[PDB]
Scaffold this active site. Structure first.
Site, PDB file in Angstrom:
ATOM      1  N   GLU A 117     -16.902  16.234  61.130  1.00 54.28           N
ATOM      2  CA  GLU A 117     -16.363  17.500  61.607  1.00 54.28           C
ATOM      3  C   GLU A 117     -15.891  18.297  60.403  1.00 54.28           C
ATOM      4  OE1 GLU A 117     -16.493  17.969  65.400  1.00 54.28           O
ATOM      5  OE2 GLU A 117     -18.067  16.719  64.546  1.00 54.28           O
ATOM      6  N   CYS A 139      -8.760  24.156  60.346  1.00 55.05           N
ATOM      7  CA  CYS A 139     -10.199  24.369  60.435  1.00 55.05           C
ATOM      8  C   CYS A 139     -10.523  25.432  61.467  1.00 55.05           C
ATOM      9  CB  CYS A 139     -10.914  23.061  60.762  1.00 55.05           C
ATOM     10  SG  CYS A 139     -10.821  21.889  59.399  1.00 55.05           S
TER      11      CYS A 139
END
Ligand SMILES: Cc1cc2nc3c(=O)[nH]c(=O)nc-3n(C[C@H](O)[C@H](O)[C@H](O)COP(=O)(O)OP(=O)(O)OC[C@H]3O[C@@H](n4cnc5c(N)ncnc54)[C@H](O)[C@@H]3O)c2cc1C
Ligand SMILES: O=C(O)[C@H]1C[C@H](O)CN1
Ligand SMILES: O=C(O)[C@H]1C[C@H](O)CN1
Length: 1214
Positions: A791, A825
């Site tokens: 990720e 993020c």
């Protein structure tokens, strides 16, 4: 060097006994609040009979004596009525009357209205929907309204337009407001003042976003006080008119977190307004707002009432909300303050205007209980009980009973008894709403009690901003005004005594059955994590002590191997906000010991796999309890080691707890003997979520039966070591969970180890790519690729059109871009503003930017902390300076000198010409802004997708056509509508994206555990009744070619696929959280045999994908004469790198072929592909050789359904 947490959150003043009694009641259980209210509100049977008689007389008068008549005259549907009022509103934006009438006569009536009227006509249609239908719909079906407007105009012409314009003009000029300006309102007040009413004027300002906004609201109040005081002409504070103000209008940072700025900057402004009200001898009332502002407002009230410059004037007023659990205690405090100061405080008792928002906020924040009642009848009893307290203190305060409820009114009228004089107490009502009732009250011929009219004043734009909230005050199913208009409600029902109804219920004060406590949001599935209320002084005091204690601890992190702690090189860990503050010591792992750790995990793998799944899940649940109990200490470590604010540290600990409990529950729902573990899993975690993502990856791997090698980020080892201590205390064996602190040399050794059976990585795309290339050199003992869950970043955009509300947008942008110093993020990187609103929103955004406090995060007042390292700071600043050097406009806040001891980047706004001007993810507090023309919206969505990322995405619009368009075309994993784009909640917004942002499956979602076992289970709720039609055409083509077995396998894949799954996940009120399975995109097929190709194609088509088939397979002759529907989805690729990006791959071959293809796939530019491989024999033996779980793409969408100003579903809950 300031001591850690020595100044975390000191209160404005020492909390008195009376103040502490308020705080103690903040979230008191509802069953505990009610009994004393019932007792205080009790009256004699004679009074109860008399009150019911008076209430019945008032209600008979009300039932015995606009838009509906217009709808009737022209036979309008609901949508036509709404569309007509939207048109009327737009026509009234045309200032000159003659120009407007000409446009109606010559252009609007004769045909196309669209040709003559950047801004949808229907921006405010949710408001007009409430007016026309009484029901709130959060977003606007603008295509339905456009159809209805064309239909009604073509059917009825100018006459209906004229009637609509005149109706909207009356409503917006005379009903929703007393007047457009204070002078107009004052002119219109004389009529009812001559009948015995008084007035308090509401200038409609609230929620300042910038200093300039607050200054504008200030000068508006000041000018209004002059007009009101001139008009009052010495009538005094009871007979004469007054003003009402909202503290949130007077400062952009009105919050407990900014209490010092509030007392230093907001208080003097209120004082100056109050001095002017004193000189004219008029009332000045402080309106009550959200529950987290109540106690702060008391500090302002205290100072003002003790300030000798305001002495001699009794006009200061203050609202208390009877729906709030603190109300009687607040009243005790106010009455005592009135005694001490000698000021006869005007106390306006209301029920409360923010009910549904208070329910949502307490749920979102995971707090112990609500700060308001959850049954409407409880608020009614609270009101009457508080009226009894106020009526016993009329010598020291002036009670003002604001209510439209005739039963409430009658109860208080008789409670107050026979002695009355003007100045003893009064009632109050809303302009254009309460006059029918109070014309039965004011005057010697009625009840001879005065009423003050709360009179909104403002332009159409100002009144429409929060009109929805005002309409819900009297428009919900439990509202008196709604019920009196409902013919199915009898007068006996309306005069029912809430005090006696509550007294006779089985459990007095029970919470509403249909409203979940925050802890119970997920029902039987799992217990929600609990947060902390940073507006509660008791919480702030206890947290201050726990945080100070955490900073005195000698935190350490060591290589914790199965055999015990190992020796290594030791260094200190420094606070990123102040490198003088040593947080702890880390001993880093040798490369030799990292390799040894993998071997020890491999040795221990059978013993951990043999722990039954339910018992592994029990360890996770025990660890979650431990983290919940340890939260205050964990906050302190996250604040100091990782540089986070307290607010964000709380949310991080909550996320860790949620991962533990979510993966435990998902395990209990799924894992059995046939879902075997992969083996040792290397978990590499990032510094930006050094507890939550650390815990999530490890917990998932462990509960799936795998021993774990945990490699935390080099920057943040201490919180990792504490997480490991907690997991081991919860029962995870040391052999099952080994901690390996250190740098990239440690991570590399772990990834390369032959016994490493899977890798979970969260971090940069570039490092993920290096890991992928190393894993491609290896196969499992079964000869299959080593799973990688990777990720990575995003280039996350938010699109804002001209229908969005600028104040909401700016708040969500400031939070999304700059929270956590932009180190999420999920952070907002590119804001896209429709050209027509871009300058206004940008001005507000820049003003809000300069209200942020940047500094070391051991103070509640800090909004933005440091970036993680000097290297991060240098990288971010180099980007900013490059943009500045290219001539781009750069806005930055000035940093205090104290920031020099740490590594800080000021929040920054950079204006770009085009999205392509941004070429790299800038992992810091740097928002880029672009503008777009409405007709280019679809191209803009292309521009967003073109970066190749696909993590978070935001859209602010009220228009269903725009929501449908944008959400159907955007390619991102986490979508957010009319809210911020950060803080994804485990099991509610399962988190993870596509393309350059990730491989999936989503963390905190139901496909995650299945990637960590060799045979994936069927997740809860994972199915779909829909069959891909190209899959079906392919199966028929196979049957026509005689490939009967493959045709059967194709049909089975069509049924097994979960493509089309479309679920709503349980979560907070006021939000809809959706989870859907879509196609991934184009899957690279690398077949070896004809049957293998048919099986690969079936799997890909059943999951909605297109394919690129390796031309080097030589299998072109196996796919002759495809149906056109299938051919559209099929391409052949000689040069795989030229034909991407792909979204996955399926490979057939022996072990050597699989390895070679896997290495070739790792070399493709762009996204890391999720690769599945099988031998020809495995394809023949196992129908699930290619698992369909990994051929669909998960999408989470979170829609803020309260964005229009209230919650439609909660209008039915009373
Ligand atoms: C002159 C005036 C001044 C006002 N000033 C303010 C202000 O400064 N601050 C403020 O917050 N509001 C203010 N209000 C609004 C007031 O708080 C009420 O929202 C509104 O007036 C309707 O209440 P009611 O007594 O008229 O009618 P009712 O129909 O008797 O009461 C409705 C109220 O019940 C409560 N309620 C509804 N459902 C539930 C439930 N499920 N559980 C618990 N309680 C529930 C809500 O408070 C709701 O507004 C003011 C109102 C007036 C008339
Ligand atoms: O890190 C450590 O060694 C322990 C010591 C103190 O309990 C804080 N954690
Ligand atoms: O920042 C967010 O949106 C969430 C997602 C990830 O789990 C870390 N916190």
């Amino acid at each position: 060097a300031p001591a850690p947490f020595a100044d975390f959150a000191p209160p404005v003043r020492p909390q008195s006994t009376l103040r502490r009694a308020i705080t103690a009641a903040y979230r008191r259980p509802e069953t505990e609040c009610l009994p004393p209210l019932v007792e205080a509100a009790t009256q004699s049977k004679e009074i109860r009979d008399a009150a019911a008689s008076t209430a019945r007389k008032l209600i008979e008068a009300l039932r015995g004596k606009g838009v509906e008549g217009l709808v009737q005259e022209y036979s309008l549907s609901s949508q036509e009525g709404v569309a007509l009022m939207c048109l009327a509103e737009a026509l009234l934006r045309i200032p000159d009357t003659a120009t407007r009438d000409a446009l109606i006569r010559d252009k609007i009536a004769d045909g196309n209205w669209k040709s003559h009227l950047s801004r949808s006509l229907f921006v405010n249609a949710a408001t007009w929907g409430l007016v026309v239908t009484g029901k709130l719909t959060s977003t606007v079906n603008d295509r339905s309204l456009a159809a209805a407007l064309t239909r009604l105009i073509s059917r009825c012409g100018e006459p209906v337009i004229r009637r609509g314009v005149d109706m909207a003009m009356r409503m917006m000029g005379e009903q929703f407001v007393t007047g457009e300006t204070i002078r107009e309102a004052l002119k219109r007040s004389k009529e009812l003042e001559e009948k015995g009413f008084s007035y308090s004027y509401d200038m409609l300002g609230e929620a300042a976003t910038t200093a300039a906004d607050a200054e504008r609201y200030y000068r508006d109040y000041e000018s209004a006080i002059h007009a009101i005081g001139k008009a009052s002409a010495g009538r005094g504070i009871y007979e004469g008119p007054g003003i009402s103000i909202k503290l949130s209008a007077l400062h952009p940072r009105y919050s407990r977190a900014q209490a010092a700025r509030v007392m230093g900057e907001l208080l003097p402004r209120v004082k100056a307004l109050a001095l002017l009200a004193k000189n004219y001898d008029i009332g000045l009332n402080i309106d009550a707002e959200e529950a987290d502002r109540l106690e702060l407002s008391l500090d302002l009230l205290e100072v003002l009432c003790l300030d000798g410059d305001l002495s001699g004037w009794n006009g200061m007023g203050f609202v208390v909300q009877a729906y709030g659990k603190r109300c009687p205690f607040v009243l005790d405090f106010i009455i005592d303050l009135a005694r001490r100061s000698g000021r006869r405080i005007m106390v306006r008792l209301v029920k409360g205007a923010y009910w549904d928002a208070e329910i949502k906020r307490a749920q979102l924040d995971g707090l112990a209980d609500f700060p308001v009642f959850t049954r409407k009848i409880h608020t009614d009893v609270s009101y009457i009980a508080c009226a009894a307290k106020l009526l016993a203190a009329t010598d020291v305060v002036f009670p003002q009973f604001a209510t439209h409820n005739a039963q409430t009114l009658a109860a208080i009228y008789h409670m107050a008894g026979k002695d009355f004089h003007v100045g003893k107490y009064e009632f109050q009502c809303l302009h254009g709403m309460g006059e029918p009732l109070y014309e039965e009250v004011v005057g010697r011929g009625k009840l001879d009690r005065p009423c003050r009219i709360y009179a909104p004043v403002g332009t159409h734009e100002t009144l429409l901003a929060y009109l929805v909230r005002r309409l819900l005050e009297n428009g919900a199913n439990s509202s008196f005004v709604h019920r009196i208009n409902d013919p199915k409600v009898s007068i006996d029902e309306l005069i029912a005594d809430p005090v006696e109804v509550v007294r006779a219920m089985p459990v007095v004060g029970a919470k509403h059955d249909r409203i979940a406590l925050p802890a119970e949001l997920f029902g039987d599935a799992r217990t929600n994590s609990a947060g902390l209320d940073l507006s509660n002084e008791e919480t702030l005091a206890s947290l201050t002590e726990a945080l100070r204690e955490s900073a005195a601890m000698k935190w350490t992190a060591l290589p914790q191997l199965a055999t015990g702690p190992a020796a290594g090189e030791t260094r200190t860990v420094l606070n990123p906000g102040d490198h003088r503050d040593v947080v702890g010591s880390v001993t880093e792992t040798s490369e030799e010991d990292a390799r040894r750790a993998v071997r020890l995990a491999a040795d221990a793998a059978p013993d951990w796999a043999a722990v039954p799944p339910s018992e592994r899940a029990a360890c996770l649940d025990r660890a979650a309890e431990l983290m919940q109990a340890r939260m205050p200490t964990l906050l302190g470590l996250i604040i100091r080691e990782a540089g986070k604010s307290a607010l964000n540290a709380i949310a991080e600990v909550r996320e860790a707890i949620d991962f533990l409990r979510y993966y435990a529950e998902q395990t209990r729902r799924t894992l059995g003997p046939g879902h075997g573990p992969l083996g040792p899993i290397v978990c590499i975690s990032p510094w930006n979520f050094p507890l939550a993502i650390f815990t999530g990856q490890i917990a998932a791997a462990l509960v799936a039966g795998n021993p774990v090698l945990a490699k935390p980020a080099e920057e943040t080892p201490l919180i990792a070591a504490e997480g490991v201590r907690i997991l081991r205390e919860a029962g995870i064996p040391a052999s099952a969970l080994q901690l390996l602190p250190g740098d990239g040399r440690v991570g590399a050794a772990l990834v390369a180890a032959a016994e490493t059976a899977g890798v979970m990585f969260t971090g940069s795309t570039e490092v993920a790519r290096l890991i992928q290339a190393q894993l491609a050199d290896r196969l499992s003992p079964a000869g299959r690729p080593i799973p990688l869950i990777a990720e990575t970043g995003g280039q996350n955009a938010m699109i804002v059109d001209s229908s969005a509300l600028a104040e909401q947008v700016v708040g969500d942008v400031i939070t999304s871009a700059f929270d956590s110093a932009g180190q999420r993020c999920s952070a907002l990187r590119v804001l896209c503003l429709q050209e027509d609103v871009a300058d206004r929103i940008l001005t507000m955004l820049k003003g809000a930017l300069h209200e942020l406090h940047i500094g070391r995060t051991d103070r509640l007042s800090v909004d933005v902390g440091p970036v993680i390292t000097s290297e991060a700071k240098d990288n971010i600043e180099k980007h900013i300076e490059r943009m500045r050097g290219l001539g781009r406009k750069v806005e930055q806040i000035g940093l205090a000198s104290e920031t020099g001891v740490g590594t800080f980047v000021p929040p920054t706004i950079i204006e770009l010409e085009k999205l392509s001007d941004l070429q790299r993810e800038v992992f810091g507090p740097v928002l880029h802004v672009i503008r777009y023309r409405r007709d280019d919206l679809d191209r803009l969505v292309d521009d967003v997708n073109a970066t190749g990322y696909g993590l978070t995405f935001g859209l602010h619009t009220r228009l269903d056509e725009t929501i449908a368009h944008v959400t159907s075309r955007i390619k991102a994993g986490n979508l957010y509508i009319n809210r911020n784009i950060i803080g994804a909640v485990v099991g509610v917004q399962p988190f993870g994206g596509r393309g350059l942002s990730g491989t999936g499956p989503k963390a905190g979602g139901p496909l995650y555990l299945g990637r960590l076992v060799t045979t994936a289970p069927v997740p809860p709720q994972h199915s779909s009744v829909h069959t891909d039609p190209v899959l079906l055409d392919f199966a028929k083509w196979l049957d026509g070619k005689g490939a009967r077995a493959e045709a059967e396998a194709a049909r089975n894949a069509g049924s097994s696929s979960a493509l089309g799954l479309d679920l709503e996940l349980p979560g907070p009120v006021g939000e809809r959280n959706l989870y859907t399975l879509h196609a991934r995109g184009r899957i690279l097929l690398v077949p070896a045999t004809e049957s293998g190709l048919y099986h690969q194609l079936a799997a890909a088509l059943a999951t909605g994908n297109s394919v690129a088939i390796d031309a080097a397979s030589g299998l072109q002759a196996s796919l002759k004469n495809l149906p056109q529907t299938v051919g559209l989805r099929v391409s052949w690729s000689k040069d795989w790198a030229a034909d991407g990006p792909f979204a996955g791959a399926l490979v057939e071959g022996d072990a050597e072929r699989i390895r070679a293809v896997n290495k070739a796939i790792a070399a493709l530019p762009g996204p890391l592909l999720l690769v599945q491989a099988a031998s020809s024999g495995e394809i023949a033996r196992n129908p699930d050789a290619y698992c369909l779980n990994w051929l669909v793409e998960e999408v989470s969408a979170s829609i803020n359904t309260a964005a229009a100003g209230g919650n439609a579903s909660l209008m039915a809950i009373g």
